[PDB]
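Reply to thread "Modeling small-molecule complexes from scratch"

Following up on the discussion above, here's a worked example others can learn from. I took a protein sequence and the SMILES for TX9 and predicted the complex. Inputs first:
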Amino acid sequence: SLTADQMVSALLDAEPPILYSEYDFSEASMMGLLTNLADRELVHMINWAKRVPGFVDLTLHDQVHLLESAWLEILMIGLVWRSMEHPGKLLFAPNLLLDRNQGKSVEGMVEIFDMLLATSSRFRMMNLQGEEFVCLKSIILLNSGVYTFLKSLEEKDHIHRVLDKITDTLIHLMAKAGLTLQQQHQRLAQLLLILSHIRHMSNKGMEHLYSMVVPSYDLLLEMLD
Amino acid sequence: SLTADQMVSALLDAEPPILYSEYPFSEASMMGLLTNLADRELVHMINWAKRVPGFVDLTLHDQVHLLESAWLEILMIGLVWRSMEHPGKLLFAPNLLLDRNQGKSVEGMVEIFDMLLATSSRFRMMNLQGEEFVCLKSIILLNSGVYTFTLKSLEEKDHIHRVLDKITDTLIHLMAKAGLTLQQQHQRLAQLLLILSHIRHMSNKGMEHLYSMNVVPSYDLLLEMLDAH
Ligand SMILES: CCCCCN1CC[C@H](COc2ccc([C@@H]3c4ccc(O)cc4CC4(CC4)N3C(=O)c3ccccc3)cc2)C1
Ligand SMILES: CCCCCN1CC[C@H](COc2ccc([C@@H]3c4ccc(O)cc4CC4(CC4)N3C(=O)c3ccccc3)cc2)C1
């Protein structure tokens, strides 16, 4: 029943914190820091998801499936967002800013590195707004697992109703921002097509990680508390 | 410079034909049949792509890269469209209609089989229209490789995004013309484009499956087909 304005406010307040790498330097250390960072972010992801309107109306089983499907995409879009104002680099954490030459030493890394950089550049060129980003991240959560699940059918119906609410919210944001109706449709489409690239990166990133992985159902369930 | 009407018309006109498998059936021959089908389908795909407005304005190198990135997605969405009206089955060809249990025979097949059936069900639930379908397939062609490509390349990406914007305009027009409200127009546009994420997912899993068993068309192969005299 939330208005578009209340949807934005709820998503903005739900934003997780920016974490730091374990601090105080080689390729082995680099991979360890990155894995440790992702593991710590995942906990905060779970708390964020529970505050996306409509998420906790789903069964716990379905909440876990959605997180299983979406967690890597969400880590990636968060990385891409905070790397926007840092051309040519990925800001994994405020104390872990890396460029593509630090990715070359690991096989398969630089390919995913450059895809992430290109997404951040696309974000930059589109002047992605924070209100838009949190809508996009919520769409990934709800959309990524919806096609791979009677009760499931209500659950899927519910997920699609929430997704429609986030679409309404994105259009509302673009309207307040002064875009014409044409520019609203075009920008909406542009933002959602980037999500297919984020899915691709998550698939390639998963392949890369299984070449050197996934949070278990039980772990995700436990974090959901 | 096309209108939405001209865009729809050109896309419908460009549609490839529905091809057949060879004329009892055996699971042992299945992958040979499907590989040959896809091979013959790829030829028509090349000539389809050349007729998608704005595609041949790109360099041959970029045309190849787009097709390299999108060919399996395009085969899959064609499959899903052909199967839409056959619940529980995948209509690879009119004479090659398979169900889930026939996918069991090969390792890792049924997982992808089920994802394709779920996409078919989603198409069916949305009552996807043929005019919407051809727009979606053209978006796949132009979008899937554009983030993995220099002044020429900047010019190419701007062109690709302008053509994608035109297709977006065309999708909205179709929905407006069919009487949907603006709220319903935006909502359906989003619903359609989010399916493309699942199609990308399916393509990556299928690409893994194909390597698990000459797996992709090569650059030079795609370029020979694309680079006509
Ligand atoms: C112990 C119980 C369950 C254990 C599960 N975890 C234990 C292994 C499981 C690690 O998955 C991970 C491991 C590492 C990354 C980093 C990471 C970290 C933070 C970020 O915000 C974003 C990213 C982005 C990225 C792409 C994905 N990544 C990389 O390095 C990278 C970047 C560029 C090019 C190639 C690679 C993410 C996910 C999760
Ligand atoms: C000389 C270099 C070779 C260049 C051409 N290659 C020739 C071998 C290289 C084979 O790719 C192929 C081979 C086979 C398929 C079928 C096929 C055929 C037609 C269709 O419309 C759609 C599909 C869909 C699907 C998923 C992909 N497929 C499968 O079986 C399948 C279906 C369900 C679950 C698991 C698997 C497509 C593509 C491509």
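What I'd highlight from this example: Chain B touches chain A through 36 residues (CB under 8 Å). The CA atoms of residues 132 and 174 of chain B lie 8 Å apart. Questions welcome below.
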